[PDB]
Symmetry: T
Subunit: 67 residues, 12 copies
């Protein structure tokens, strides 16, 4: 039947988790078609003078392949 592919991306944001996820999805849309779902694999980040410097959300993005 249909076949999907999953790519692993890492979105980042200085503001929050949702923002980091949205950033990765927005970049994905630039070159990928038929984006369907995502799975968060890891949540990490860097530390700076303001506490969190960058939130880094590692996720798998699943999209349908064309035939």
């Amino acid at each position: 039947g249909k076949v999907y592919k999953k790519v692993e991306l890492v979105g980042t944001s200085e503001e929050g988790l949702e923002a980091a996820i949205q950033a990765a999805l927005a970049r994905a849309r630039k070159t990928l078609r038929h984006l369907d779902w995502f799975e968060v694999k890891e949540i990490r980040g860097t530390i700076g003078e303001a506490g969190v410097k960058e939130y880094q959300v590692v996720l798998e993005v699943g999209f349908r392949l064309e035939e």
Copy 2:
């Protein structure tokens, strides 16, 4: 001693992670008593024209059983 039960629910929200968690907990309260804690097992979601379509947070909800 006391015995607790853990049920697995999936809360969803178009707005964010916390909202999805709160949605699952609110639904849990409708039929379950003595809700005590929760554990997030997975964070995933669907993708749409606005990026994230639905955030889906899979969690275990622990509550005390009556004797």
Copy 3:
């Protein structure tokens, strides 16, 4: 063929590990029939003035579903 169900319970006891497991199984028997096996998922607990206060054993209890 036959179908079984697994429920997740957390047995607790101030006596010890075995007692915590037994507490969960005793409560399970109150509303579940055809209890067959259990699987320990986690062993944890609270700390008191002189050591372990309450042992908490998270387990899955498997039982056969009726007709």
Copy 4:
């Protein structure tokens, strides 16, 4: 929407798909809005002729009424 996941173990002497079908058929007896499943484990018992009973442990997700 809020979904719930229950854990069932389907069994069958025939094969993996049959074991999964057995669990879903029983789920349907009392659960509405069945949507997806996830296989957690595949195991089974052994007899003189090899596999006696195939056992598929799965999580079944369904939408809760609101």
Copy 5:
């Protein structure tokens, strides 16, 4: 020495597990050369009116990279 690459695909089929796996490998062959092995990561699916609707097998496909 040689270097291989692994891509993550989700093969789907309404026929069964093997068919889902075969669907993923058939699509992989369309754009990937020197396909060598696969590893199943997850088996899941959707539910229909009378049982499994679509089987979905998440797998990693390993292939040798060219010069």
Copy 6:
């Protein structure tokens, strides 16, 4: 009380998953006694010109050991 042992085998077959599992169990039967249960640890395989070449199912086979 009783003690069981678990051996890890990889059954293979060009036919399918069930056939691969059965191949491992058939082999275990040649030199082991009291085979009771199995647990699938991994499912993988090789690829050929027609898709799956060989299905490979990694499993643990549990059997009862004879009493002292």
Copy 7:
């Protein structure tokens, strides 16, 4: 070369996940130097009349050791 140490902390907040993470990082800065990165290990929490009572984020905080 350089050597880092990782400590496990649990930040809490009644308001959200990011707030809980920031709380742990702020406490870490009180006694630790050279804070560099963090990794979320678990997200859980307590339940109250308002739904979530306390969000609890378990994280590893990595920092460089001095020589």
Copy 8:
């Protein structure tokens, strides 16, 4: 240097966890040499009319192999 081997056994006992572990170690001693350490992999069991029927502790037993 030295090489060790690990075997997987499931000790059982109606008495408790420690007893189940001891049962597996006692059995390992019958045919193995240089038993050094063990690691509990899983704790499970069967259920009877009075709660736990049989405790089952799955463990890996590590032992030293004789030098070449």
Copy 9:
């Protein structure tokens, strides 16, 4: 509130509970506000009479002073 988790390995020739008690007793010597523990691993050494030393690896959580 902010908590910290440390990893200790309690040991005892007696049993699992005794091993856990040993780790908690040592934790109490230098750590305040001990609240909970989580068993990470259960292992041990072997002697001529079976278990020599039971070893319980656990994480101990305690509240940090503010």
Copy 10:
């Protein structure tokens, strides 16, 4: 910034580091802004003289162009 992670398996008859270097060298052929790697698995093949080929499965992270 947004990064991407690809999974490669480097191999070498020499050792672990050489296997890792092999994967990174191939990655560099088509991927820009290579930043970090994570070893997922270490395995290999066996021959008459022991290890034939060391195989290191790793994830390679790189920054995507914006």
Copy 11:
């Protein structure tokens, strides 16, 4: 079809990781046949006055079993 078996061994060496892996494979060769692949499960070791004393690599060794 064909069936393989996997044994778990811990190779050790004061020299390094590769040497530890090689030690386990050399030992496996003494009593096993058709050794085909290995998988590292864990890397650990002991500590001495000069840092690492003994490297210990836990691995699974897969080999083909003879046909029925």
Copy 12:
């Protein structure tokens, strides 16, 4: 009986894996007594102009606690 403690360190080195492990153990010895064993949790690193820049080995170091 005896009680041991495990600390998590990340040894780094531009020389190789063993060197990274040795760096962590050398630093550990500076403030920890009765060092006994170590367990590798992760192997990772940074990438430079011609390959691995810095190897980073995350490990747990176990040592015996004193009276």
